[PDB]
Design a protein around this nucleic acid. Structure first.
Ligand SMILES: [Ca+2]
Ligand SMILES: [Ca+2]
Ligand SMILES: [Ca+2]
Ligand SMILES: [Ca+2]
Ligand SMILES: [Fe+3]
Ligand SMILES: [Fe+3]
Lengths: 354, 353
DNA sequence: CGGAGGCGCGGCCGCGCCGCCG
DNA sequence: CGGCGGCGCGGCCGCGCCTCCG
């Protein structure tokens, strides 16, 4: 029922979408997303028990879902540049240059940036775990330590010393799972090395069994617990003058799983290709949730990220929905808590003999 | 720097408890808390890589702390009964029977409950994962599924069919860690079987180096993330008329780590052996945080849980402190965000030749 | 109704930043 | 002004409940 969906960036379950490059990435063991970003060959960062498992496919409530399972699978600079526009308040057709932070060591691009600042072209450099390293805000007696997945830097000048106008934050959350992939990885790895035709073997019942061997479901409530807190906290930090906006990038599958956690919220249609969660018409701290898909239309080797839903969020609404609205629905007339007393009595009754 | 604090329920780092009972439980691999709760010999439920590591000792901000790392180490029926009195509204000195749900199978205790009920004595049966299994509430379109660590059934009737007046909820939280215990466990496991006099070997430099082998620190923020959500949600659920109250039981160490998460809060002294987090005069959700210690006074082999701090919480204040007050402190003067713009530029300048 | 699978729960794992000590 | 190390972060792990499907 549960399947490894992508193996080193390339589809294996729903379709075995494999070109010549797909054969190579899997044989060498290379995450194509780190390689394309850094322009240097890079193997997946994961331990042997889950090596190359970038996406897992499962059903919840009788519907199929791709679950991103590696933060590096959502390492799509092109998508992040687009989401950046919404954070810094740029138009859709505005000149923008989105470069990595390690590139700043190169003279050729430092001379290039200066020319862009003269033209009025926006220059944003990003700091990411494997591309420059993350940035952190230190703990206090009244505040905990925090780290940002993507720190965006809007450049003002770099003439003598690099200086920024504003900064941006993108937070990525994928999904973690129950159990292990060890058995599914182990079974498909022997068909990779010892086997003579791997891609022709994956769509077969034997390969489909191997891709699913002891594969379990997603840790749904776990990521909501961890991501909700970071949302509420980091969105409040976005209200700082020098912070242009904070956005959380999450897959469609993850967004849908959060709906019950948010008391089944109705999104407001703004008529601007964007949606809103609560009243964002006043005193806004430019808080965003970018719900993305794995592009089902591209045909290109690794499916890139495509926008699915762009939600501007009211923080107090987000807090109120999760911690007040949802419990009240659980305390509803036909809800689970109404019948709980009978459940306790039923569970007690099981210990009675005969 | 970081040490295994106790092995199979008996202290090993700060002081080595060297009783015959401490030697026996270690050599036989029994978690002494499960075997005492259901009166049947039971080994630790943990996997080989962390087997027996029921507590870990670490320093944060230059002071020592014991981190419980096994929910079964907090399995203390004696402590939970005292905490339940606060939940159901019993005085400190009034009759109370606190029994595990599995025992309901016995006809001797079933008749015993009937005898207690008609003499006004309170009877509460508890459901815990290893003792009767946990109770859960199922998901809806507007609410997620939840499980309760301890669900407490205040019995009123047994004769025809078991029936309860109210239910109570106790949630238990300890601590998870970074890295592995594997290397420290494997270093002392070979000392247990292949060597002689295990306790005498533990306090030596070589032993203390073994107890600390690649031992890392507590996963502090992780635990707050997971538990805060359960607090806010389950405390709101406690408002239900059939729910007497819900309490969260945590070690002192983890409560101290929560202070920065709660904008450094100041507890209001009620002058009744109880403190309050916010205004708890009106509308009572009957929500509690029971902060406990590993009893340092009594020198029994496994040191039981002793009350350290008994807190009434205003749920709305708990949410406010963590999600509004704390972020505002971080944005304040001399805060980390104030100097963040310079940090970006400094990190940006590190690429310059 | 009985075995299989979903998933809350909560402890294992290591990367890489930054604070602390010498 | 360098290297141990604390710790945020976020993905691995399996227990035992319950709901679903044959
Ligand atoms: Ca991060
Ligand atoms: Ca995140
Ligand atoms: Ca708990
Ligand atoms: Ca539990
Ligand atoms: Fe990957
Ligand atoms: Fe244990």
């Amino acid at each position: 029922a549960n399947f490894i969906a992508e193996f080193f960036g390339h589809r294996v379950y729903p379709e075995v979408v494999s070109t010549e490059a797909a054969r190579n990435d899997q044989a060498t063991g290379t995450c194509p997303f780190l390689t394309a970003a850094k322009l240097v060959e890079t193997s997946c960062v994961k331990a042997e028990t889950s090596r190359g498992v970038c996406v897992v496919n499962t059903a919840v409530d009788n519907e199929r879902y791709d679950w991103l399972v590696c933060p590096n699978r959502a390492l799509d600079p092109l998508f992040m540049s687009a989401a950046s526009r919404k954070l810094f308040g740029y138009g859709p057709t505005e000149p923008l240059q989105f470069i990595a932070a390690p590139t700043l060591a190169d003279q050729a691009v430092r001379d290039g940036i200066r020319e862009w600042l003269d033209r009025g072209v926006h220059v944003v450099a990003y700091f990411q775990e494997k591309l420059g390293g993350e940035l952190s805000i230190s703990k206090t007696d009244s505040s905990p330590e925090f780290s940002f997945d993507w720190t965006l830097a809007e450049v003002e000048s770099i003439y003598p010393v690099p200086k920024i106008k504003r900064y941006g934050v993108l937070e990525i959350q994928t999904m973690d799972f129950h159990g292990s992939y060890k058995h599914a990885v182990g079974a498909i790895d022997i068909a990779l090395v010892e086997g003579i035709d791997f891609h022709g073997w994956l769509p077969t019942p034997a390969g489909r069994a191997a891709l699913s061997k002891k594969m379990e479901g997603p840790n749904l409530s776990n990521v909501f617990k961890r991501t909700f807190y970071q949302m509420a906290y980091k969105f409040a930090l976005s209200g700082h003058q020098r912070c242009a906006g904070t956005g959380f990038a999450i897959p469609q599958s993850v967004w849908k799983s959060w709906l019950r956690h948010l008391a089944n919220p109705t999104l407001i249609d703004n008529g601007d290709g964007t949606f809103s969660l609560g009243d964002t018409r006043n005193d806004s701290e430019n808080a965003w949730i970018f719900v993305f898909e794995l592009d089902p239309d591209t045909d290109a080797s690794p499916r890139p990220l495509a926008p699915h839903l762009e939600i501007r969020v009211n923080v107090d609404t987000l807090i109120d929905l999760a911690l007040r609205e949802s419990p009240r629905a659980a305390l509803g007339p036909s809800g689970p808590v109404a019948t709980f007393t009978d459940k306790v009595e039923a569970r007690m009754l099981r210990f009675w003999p005969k």
